[PDB]
Design an enzyme around this catalytic site. Structure first.
Site, PDB file in Angstrom:
ATOM      1  CD  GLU A 100      53.070-112.078 -15.516  1.00 24.61           C
ATOM      2  OE1 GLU A 100      53.849-111.392 -16.212  1.00 24.61           O
ATOM      3  OE2 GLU A 100      53.365-113.202 -15.066  1.00 24.61           O
ATOM      4  CG  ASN A 109      35.870-100.306   5.751  1.00 23.21           C
ATOM      5  OD1 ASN A 109      36.708-100.434   6.644  1.00 23.21           O
ATOM      6  ND2 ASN A 109      35.354-101.341   5.100  1.00 23.21           N
ATOM      7  CD  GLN A 132      31.612-111.235  11.245  1.00 26.47           C
ATOM      8  OE1 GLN A 132      31.156-111.674  10.190  1.00 26.47           O
ATOM      9  NE2 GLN A 132      31.240-111.698  12.432  1.00 26.47           N
TER      10      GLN A 132
HETATM   11  N1  LIG Z   1      34.456-104.487   4.067  1.00 22.19           N
HETATM   12  C1  LIG Z   1      33.947-104.964   5.198  1.00 22.19           C
HETATM   13  N2  LIG Z   1      34.590-104.729   6.396  1.00 22.19           N
HETATM   14  C2  LIG Z   1      34.075-105.211   7.553  1.00 22.19           C
HETATM   15  C3  LIG Z   1      32.898-105.947   7.543  1.00 22.19           C
HETATM   16  N3  LIG Z   1      32.615-106.302   8.814  1.00 22.19           N
HETATM   17  C4  LIG Z   1      33.581-105.812   9.621  1.00 22.19           C
HETATM   18  N4  LIG Z   1      34.493-105.129   8.860  1.00 22.19           N
HETATM   19  C5  LIG Z   1      35.708-104.450   9.347  1.00 22.19           C
HETATM   20  O1  LIG Z   1      36.299-105.198  10.395  1.00 22.19           O
HETATM   21  C6  LIG Z   1      36.776-104.341  11.412  1.00 22.19           C
HETATM   22  C7  LIG Z   1      36.691-105.002  12.785  1.00 22.19           C
HETATM   23  O2  LIG Z   1      36.878-106.400  12.713  1.00 22.19           O
HETATM   24  P1  LIG Z   1      35.593-107.371  12.678  1.00 22.19           P
HETATM   25  O3  LIG Z   1      35.156-107.597  11.253  1.00 22.19           O
HETATM   26  O4  LIG Z   1      34.475-106.772  13.497  1.00 22.19           O
HETATM   27  O5  LIG Z   1      36.035-108.788  13.301  1.00 22.19           O
HETATM   28  P2  LIG Z   1      37.559-109.299  13.385  1.00 22.19           P
HETATM   29  O6  LIG Z   1      38.434-108.625  12.356  1.00 22.19           O
HETATM   30  O7  LIG Z   1      37.562-110.792  13.173  1.00 22.19           O
HETATM   31  O8  LIG Z   1      38.046-108.963  14.881  1.00 22.19           O
HETATM   32  P3  LIG Z   1      37.257-109.523  16.170  1.00 22.19           P
HETATM   33  O9  LIG Z   1      36.016-108.690  16.395  1.00 22.19           O
HETATM   34  O10 LIG Z   1      38.154-109.425  17.381  1.00 22.19           O
HETATM   35  O11 LIG Z   1      36.886-110.968  15.948  1.00 22.19           O
HETATM   36  C8  LIG Z   1      35.910-103.095  11.336  1.00 22.19           C
HETATM   37  O12 LIG Z   1      36.677-101.937  11.568  1.00 22.19           O
HETATM   38  C9  LIG Z   1      35.357-103.087   9.926  1.00 22.19           C
HETATM   39  O13 LIG Z   1      35.962-102.066   9.170  1.00 22.19           O
HETATM   40  C10 LIG Z   1      32.245-106.186   6.340  1.00 22.19           C
HETATM   41  O14 LIG Z   1      31.202-106.837   6.322  1.00 22.19           O
HETATM   42  N5  LIG Z   1      32.774-105.692   5.168  1.00 22.19           N
HETATM   43 MG   LIG Z   2      35.455-110.377  14.548  1.00 19.57          MG
END
Ligand SMILES: Nc1nc2c(ncn2[C@@H]2O[C@H](COP(=O)(O)OP(=O)(O)OP(=O)(O)O)[C@@H](O)[C@H]2O)c(=O)[nH]1
Ligand SMILES: [Mg+2]
Ligand SMILES: Nc1nc2c(ncn2[C@@H]2O[C@H](COP(=O)(O)OP(=O)(O)OP(=O)(O)O)[C@@H](O)[C@H]2O)c(=O)[nH]1
Ligand SMILES: Nc1nc2c(ncn2[C@@H]2O[C@H](COP(=O)(O)OP(=O)(O)O)[C@@H](O)[C@H]2O)c(=O)[nH]1
Ligand SMILES: Nc1nc2c(ncn2[C@@H]2O[C@H](COP(=O)(O)OP(=O)(O)O)[C@@H](O)[C@H]2O)c(=O)[nH]1
Ligand SMILES: [Mg+2]
Lengths: 426, 48, 428, 157, 426, 427
Positions: free
Chosen positions: C245, C197, C10
């Site tokens: 590098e 984050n 995501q």
């Molecule tokens: N920097 C950043 N981190 C994000 C963002 N959205 C989600 N995260 C991080 O992703 C972590 C959880 O994973 P998700 O992004 O919700 O989705 P996923 O990694 O594909 O895992 P699933 O929900 O099982 O599909 C959270 O703890 C967030 O820290 C974002 O828009 N920007």
């Molecule tokens: Mg996800």
């Protein structure tokens, strides 16, 4: 008559050589388009050393450019005087070594060094009588140090009766760009001591100090340092390209500067180097040039000659002067600072004069000194090499490719014995 | 010749200073318009 | 020279949405994807006449975000086959996304990137974007990097992962996912760059002074960092470095690859009017913990090596002087082995400004990438709370029902313990 | 005319350069040297002859003084020497924004990225691109050595 | 043939030297742009003593400026004739000692003195045979006094066979600026008795007295005092720069005025010095110049000659004059006031005449008389030094830097033995 | 030559508001932040056509800070310079030194580190604070001590405002003064006191202002500071920098307490009648009626003196005037130093400010000396401090903050030792 080819390795070597070619082309009065436009006829008799007749006043430099990243070639060609080089001499790989001596000496060398060897051979037997070769490269990088060094070895095993100049920039703690600088530098100097006939030790820290103090430059970009180094190479070979009252070619300088085969590392300086404001208050005389020459801060290396002794020294002169003044000035500078000169060698200075000064200056001079003070920089490099080598930091990127440890031991032992004999002759 | 070249040098430097000052003055204006557009969008949001 | 970028999870494809938007505005390419009436060749392959397609794939299991990107502004930009989409989300389950759904989705991505690389001629490497907290970015992402390593191996793979913050956390079972992902990330990814984050939250709250910041600004800053570290490949400078590098200059040992990243100057629109920009203060600004992209304390650690990516109007003399002054200061200390722990680089073009953003246009900026032992504390902190829940067999039933056992959990825990021992011994 | 107007603009603003007074001093020394050649090695005779040469010229009608000598000095310098981006980045109107408009009530967060109109001042000042045309024109990196040696012997006699 | 270098220290020394260079350039007809505009060819044969040929008739003063505050440099450049100095000789620190002899002799001097010796060697080797070195400073300030003291010591240990002139303005309780005057003065005079060949004592109180009485000025700015000192220093070296009927170089005056190696402190008087209104009613004859010379109010020190005995005396005369008148006048002034002259040395005056008067005046004279009346001011300052050192006032700044009490004891002991020998010879 | 100014306390911020408006007025810098080399000691050339003062206003109560943020000079100061707290120390030295100080001082130190990084030829620091208050006393001592820890050898000028003996606005201010002096003894380098009631008398008598507010007080304080720093700012016939006060006005390592004076404080109407020369203003700078500290120099002995001259001033008549002062027997000096004076002449005259109460005067004199009147001032403060401490009044607030009685006793004994030092120096 006498022929000098030019070889440029790596980004630093390519840019420095581009500036050098610009300077020499301007000195011979040929415009960036490639046609002669000078006034004096004296410029015509001595351009076969660096150029070739193509088509009715078309001159192509006798240079070979080798690298691995197209950015360097694009930068060389985009700038002025970039359309004079023949595209056939642009021998060029595609992958990239990237500050890796092992990569640039074993991996990318086996497929690209043969091609540049063929190019330089075709360029070498094209002319009549070879005087020597001129190679410009760095020592911290990968594609400039390793490939350049292997080219040096191959050429030396091919043409052993032909001399070789290599202008190499060395790393310093004050000006330290890459992290593997000692690892590359030790192997490069270990291979160069048996292959290269002599080298000119250069470094960025001394150039920065010179352009701060003497030049008083506000934003000294790489262009100014490359201009200074190009002036150095133009001065060192000016005797071949112009007549003088006392001619001295590369062989004469090499035999007069090298007392022992392993004592062939020199530090170079250029003069005059005056600020933009103090140029009007200055005087133009031989004693002024000599005094600005032997200055410790005027050297282009981070090794104070006051910390050691001079074995042999050489000064190359350009302009309408008097020989008696030159000889008496050298005698005076030897008599005054007698301690700084070695004792068992009388007349530690070789002097030469040329009748054609560079445009923009009435009187110029080039200084090449072979002092034992360079051993401190070798000790400085070797101690860093040992410190990083004690716990095998950054080691497996070399060994994991084909490199081995006993060659590192050989390189450090060679550096140690070289600095030991330097201290011996002190 | 040397003095003429030096004089041309500071002339070029002053030209660069002037154009950079003009550019710095230029770069300011964009923020306010975006500010008003954002307020208008928020007003539309709250009305809806 | 070209490099392709893949985005997993995501967060990965949101970061990619920010990145490609920044790239398109930087190269002057319209959102549709055609030249209005040459450096783009490393990212965009020119198709037909006056049309460019990015060298990227967006793959995920839940189709909502993927087809939202499909129906967004950049429909004509991304190739339809590139935006891979699954059928069911892994639902924050490393085992599910690594073995159940990954088996039937990794092959399509593999033979897609195979032809993508076939289109390429000067492939420098790869760079991946994923979040270890989730399941999709952890499981199938780790599987894809494993298969890439067994496919090419010698080619660089840059891992810009997002670890969960110590105090700030959105998921609950994310320590398990992080541990299981690291178990393969240690020996699969070549060079990895760390990003938290809460650190970015503090950066935008203090420096950028947005009191209500969302993920959009975070992704914009991540895209700015990637653009700063890639502009050397894209644009020519006085001293340029490529993606190779980082393989040698930043990695001290084959198993110690976790960079600390930082960027400077992080400045708002009004602050730039007041302060003066020069190399010394931005070089200093790249070393305080208040400008780190990872929530940690470099004071308790020692630097092994540092890298300096520079953009804009910076000469080498003053940055060299700044590096010398930094070395002279004793507030920060280097490792006993490496005296010259620096790697500098300069590019001519300044970083570009995104319309609608809060980052003001800056004449010169610094992207700092270093390596310290504070990550040794980060992994220990994560492993302590991982052991906290694992001691009572909490949430293990989901994973064992997926098909796994206690063996991989125990082996990952002892692998992290061994990594902690390596960090503490390399620190000495 | 352009050089004169730029010059006068500077002198009114007191913008005379350091290199300018150095040039003026150098010209004065050159005049002194020429006078020395005229009157022999004695500098006294040189500066004398300079003074009678200056005083010998008959004055011309004028309305003021400062502008008269300013124009004279400018024309002396004039005799001495002469002293005084892709189309997409220059203009933004060439590119079409053509964004995807969305319902005012229903606004997703991912739609913010690609919906904002760039301006002229948002564009970079200089676009130092690299032209890979010369590198592309090169053949495949797989080179080869295929030649027959025909080098004439040119021994150094 | 004989050359003199110029060294200035601190605000007062720099301004005094600026006025000196202005008046000398006006005397030799050199415009503020460094070009010749004089009338007589006689102004050209003796300019190598203070100037150097730069580029086709461009003259640069043989001076080295050294100080520690940028305001001094800005003031020097702002005024006229400030653009004739070579910028390379503008050696300059950055922090400033600030009325601290210990600072300017141990901390700031330690890292700035290498550069000033480098530049003074650069300037000294430029000429052929040095005649002497000239230094202008004061004994009240901390920056100028300490740095000039250590520089004089370095020159003495480097060049001990050359003459040396030092002009020092010593403070008085009447005109007292700083609180630490005795501490600086005692140490400076302690070092000067073993290093300086001779010293020229100047004082601001006497300058104020003479400009109040003789000049009758209402606003005597520092410019007038510096002009008076500049005229004095022009008069003392006039013999080298112009031929005369009776020549007397610096060495001749030094040997004929110094009877013992520790007796090298002199008072200064200059004639004519009259109000503009009274200049019309006054004549130009040698007895009147003499009576204006020997007047006790004309001396530029806080030491009444009538309170002591004249050991030796010297008169420097400028203008085409009568020798018989000169020596008969000196004989009469010795015969009349026979009590003020020493007994065991007959003919206590050395006389000289120069045929070139200063511009604007038909006749001029300079007086340098070595008498024992100067010991009263030494006691005047040493009693303040002892009073301050009795309870250790203002000491921790000096002591906290590294120097200790035995230096103070040595300095005061030298002062007491000096004054005791002055009394012995009185 | 660069020097920065930091302002601690409610009084310090208003003093800075007066000082910086005076600096911008004299340098011709408009309140927006740009002019229509001398300014380099106070302002930094940022980008192009922008000057930022080298200053920080730090305090705990945000009222004055936000008033400055919303005033006329909104764009003059960099916004994040103005460090502001969330809760006041409330006239409690213990609170301002241990409760709130431990969380707010670190940010100010991290800022001044960068401020000095921007500087290259830093002459030193100078602090503004009132020892009567809490914020100006509590966290000021901690900031000064860690300043000495970080730099030490750089000059730190302490311009304090001591509470008046009979005029007072607070009650527990003797405790704050004692505990502040306990650290100011060994932390600051040169200290200058300026009482408020003395300024009231100066404005009542000379400026004939029957109802003056703090604006005039801070205006004349700014005039004094500008007269002190004009030598650094502009070249003169006899320049004197800030380092001299260290080596020329401090006779003992633990005795650094300066009495300040300024002359002439003359109204516009009186300016047209009284002829300005040097002798009368030099005499005027020595009577107690022109002192900013309520003390009697007649009861004391001058160890040393410093004199600042601005405008049309020549050295001859100032030397004559100082000689006449030395010959006069109405004032006596210490038996140790006979030459107890220090003169300084600057070309630029002090400037006038619209809305101010001073006239266009050709010349001005600022006098700084040292006598034993500080000894009687400290003793007078110590008697009433002991009166406070005899019944353990208000001590419970400090105790509950986390402090005890040991430091109170040690500070009282330090004051007794200082009194012994003054009485033995007076011998
Ligand atoms: N920097 C950043 N981190 C994000 C963002 N959205 C989600 N995260 C991080 O992703 C972590 C959880 O994973 P998700 O992004 O919700 O989705 P996923 O990694 O594909 O895992 P699933 O929900 O099982 O599909 C959270 O703890 C967030 O820290 C974002 O828009 N920007
Ligand atoms: Mg996800
Ligand atoms: N001369 C002068 N003194 C002031 C001024 N304002 C306050 N003071 C003095 O400062 C003392 C109290 O401290 P304040 O400046 O009011 O505020 P503070 O130092 O921050 O201490 P707190 O108010 O407790 O936070 C009072 O007794 C006043 O004598 C002023 O404008 N001018
Ligand atoms: N004088 C000069 N030196 C340079 C320039 N560019 C790089 N260098 C030096 O070259 C070193 C890096 O070498 P590098 O380019 O990596 O070598 P390569 O990898 O073999 O091409 C640095 O230490 C720089 O000091 C230049 O334009 N001029
Ligand atoms: N003749 C003359 N004497 C001066 C001048 N300025 C200062 N002085 C004297 O020099 C002394 C001050 O010395 P100081 O400035 O501290 O020395 P410095 O700091 O090393 O330059 C005073 O006693 C003055 O009498 C000047 O312009 N002319
Ligand atoms: Mg308050």
């Amino acid at each position: 008559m006498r022929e000098i080819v030019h070889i440029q390795g790596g980004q630093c070597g390519n840019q420095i050589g581009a500036k050098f070619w610009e300077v020499v082309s301007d000195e011979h009065g040929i415009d960036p388009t490639g046609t002669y436009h000078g006034d004096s006829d004296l410029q015509l008799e001595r351009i076969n050393v660096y150029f070739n007749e193509a088509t009715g006043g078309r001159y192509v430099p006798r240079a070979i450019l080798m690298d691995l990243e197209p950015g360097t070639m694009d930068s060389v060609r985009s700038g002025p005087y970039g359309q004079i080089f023949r595209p056939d001499n642009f021998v060029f790989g595609q992958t990239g070594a990237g500050n890796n001596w092992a990569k640039g000496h074993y991996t990318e060398g086996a497929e690209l060094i043969d091609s540049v060897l063929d190019v330089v051979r075709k360029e070498a037997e094209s002319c009549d009588c070879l005087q020597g070769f001129q190679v410009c490269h760095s020592l911290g990088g990968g594609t400039g140090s390793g490939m350049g060094t292997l080219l040096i070895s191959k050429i030396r095993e091919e043409y052993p009766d032909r001399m070789m100049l290599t202008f190499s920039v060395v790393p310093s703690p004050k000006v330290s760009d890459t992290v593997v600088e000692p690892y590359n530098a030790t192997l490069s100097v270990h291979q160069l001591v048996e292959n290269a006939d002599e080298c000119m030790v250069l470094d960025n820290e001394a150039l920065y100090d010179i352009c701060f103090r003497t030049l008083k430059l506000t934003t000294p970009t790489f262009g100014d340092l490359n201009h200074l180094i190009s002036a150095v190479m133009s001065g060192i070979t000016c005797c071949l390209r112009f007549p003088g009252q006392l001619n001295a070619d590369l062989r004469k300088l090499a035999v007069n500067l090298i007392p022992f085969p392993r004592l062939h590392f020199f530090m170079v300086g250029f003069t005059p180097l005056t600020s933009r404001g103090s140029q009007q208050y200055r005087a133009l005389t031989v004693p002024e040039l000599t005094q600005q020459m032997w200055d410790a801060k005027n050297m282009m290396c981070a090794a104070d000659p006051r910390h050691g002794r001079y074995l042999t020294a050489s000064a190359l002169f350009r302009g309408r002067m008097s020989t008696k003044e030159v000889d008496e000035q050298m005698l005076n500078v030897q008599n005054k600072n007698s301690s700084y000169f070695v004792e068992w060698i009388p007349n530690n200075v070789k002097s030469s004069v040329c009748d054609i000064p560079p445009k923009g200056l009435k009187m110029s001079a080039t200084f090449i000194g072979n002092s034992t003070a360079i051993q401190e920089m070798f000790k400085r490099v070797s101690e860093q090499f040992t410190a990083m080598f004690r716990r095998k930091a950054f080691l497996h990127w070399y060994t994991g490719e084909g490199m081995d440890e006993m060659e590192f031991t050989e390189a450090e032992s060679n550096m140690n014995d070289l600095v030991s004999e330097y201290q011996q002759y002190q | 010749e040397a003095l003429s070249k030096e004089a041309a040098d500071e002339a070029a430097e002053l030209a660069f200073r002037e154009r950079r000052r003009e550019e710095m003055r230029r770069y300011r204006e964009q923020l306010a318009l975006m500010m008003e557009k954002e307020r208008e969008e928020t007003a539309e949001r709250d009305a809806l | 020279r070209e490099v392709i970028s893949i985005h997993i999870g995501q967060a990965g494809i949101q970061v990619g949405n920010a990145c490609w938007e920044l790239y398109c505005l930087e190269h002057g390419i319209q959102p549709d994807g055609q030249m209005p009436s040459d450096a783009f060749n490393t990212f965009f392959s020119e198709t037909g006449a006056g049309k460019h397609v990015p060298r990227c794939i967006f793959l995920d299991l839940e189709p909502t975000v993927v087809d939202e990107v499909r129906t967004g502004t950049y429909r004509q930009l991304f190739h339809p086959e590139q935006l891979i989409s699954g059928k069911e989300d892994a639902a924050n389950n490393f085992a599910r996304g690594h073995y159940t759904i990954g088996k039937e989705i990794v092959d399509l991505a593999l033979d897609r990137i195979r032809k993508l690389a076939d289109n390429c001629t000067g492939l420098q490497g790869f760079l991946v974007f994923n979040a270890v907290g989730g399941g999709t970015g952890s499981g199938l992402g780790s599987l894809l990097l494993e298969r890439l390593s067994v496919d090419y191996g010698k080619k660089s793979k840059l891992g810009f992962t997002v670890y969960p913050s110590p105090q700030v956390s959105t998921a609950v079972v994310e320590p398990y996912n992080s541990v299981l992902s690291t178990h393969s990330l240690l020996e699969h990814t070549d060079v990895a760059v760390m990003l938290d984050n809460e650190a970015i939250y503090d950066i935008c709250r203090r420096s950028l002074d947005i009191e209500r910041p969302t993920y959009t600004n975070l992704n914009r800053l991540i895209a700015q960092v990637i653009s700063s570290l890639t502009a050397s490949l894209r644009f020519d400078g006085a001293l340029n470095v490529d993606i190779t590098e980082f393989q040698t200059n930043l990695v001290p040992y084959p198993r110690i690859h976790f960079m600390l990243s930082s960027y400077a100057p992080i400045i708002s629109a009004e602050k730039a009017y007041h302060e003066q920009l020069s190399v010394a203060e931005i070089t200093n600004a790249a070393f305080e913990p208040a400008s780190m992209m990872v929530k940690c304390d470099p004071r308790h650690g020692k630097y092994m090596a540092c890298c300096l990516m520079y953009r804009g109007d910076v000469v080498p003399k003053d940055v060299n002087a700044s590096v010398a002054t930094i070395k002279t200061k004793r507030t920060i200390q280097f490792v006993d082995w490496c005296p010259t722990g620096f790697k500098c680089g300069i590019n001519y073009q300044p970083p570009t400004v995104v319309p609608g953003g809060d980052l003001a246009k800056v004449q010169r900026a610094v992207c700092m990438i270093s390596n310290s032992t504070a990550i040794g504390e980060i992994f220990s902190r994560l492993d302590h709370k991982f052991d906290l829940m694992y001691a009572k067999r909490a949430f293990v039933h989901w994973y064992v029902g997926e098909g796994m056992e206690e063996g991989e959990f125990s082996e990952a825990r002892e692998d992290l313990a061994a990594l902690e021992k390596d960090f503490e011994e390399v620190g000495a | 005319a352009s050089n004169f107007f730029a010059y006068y603009a500077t002198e009114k603003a007191g913008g005379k350069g350091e290199a300018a007074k150095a040039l003026d001093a150098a010209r004065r020394l050159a005049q002194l040297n020429e006078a020395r050649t005229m009157a022999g090695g004695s500098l006294a005779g040189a500066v004398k002859l300079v003074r009678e040469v200056e005083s010998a010229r008959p004055p011309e009608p004028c309305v003021d003084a400062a502008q008269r000598k300013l124009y004279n000095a400018f024309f002396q310098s004039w005799l001495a020497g002469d002293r005084h981006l892709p189309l997409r980045f220059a203009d933004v109107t060439t590119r079409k924004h053509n964004p995807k408009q969305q319902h005012p009530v229903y606004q997703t967060s991912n739609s913010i990225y690609g919906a904002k109109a760039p301006s002229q001042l948002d564009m970079p000042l200089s676009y130092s691109s690299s032209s890979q045309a010369f590198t592309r024109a090169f053949p495949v990196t797989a080179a080869k050595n295929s030649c027959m040696v025909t080098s004439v012997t040119r021994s150094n006699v």
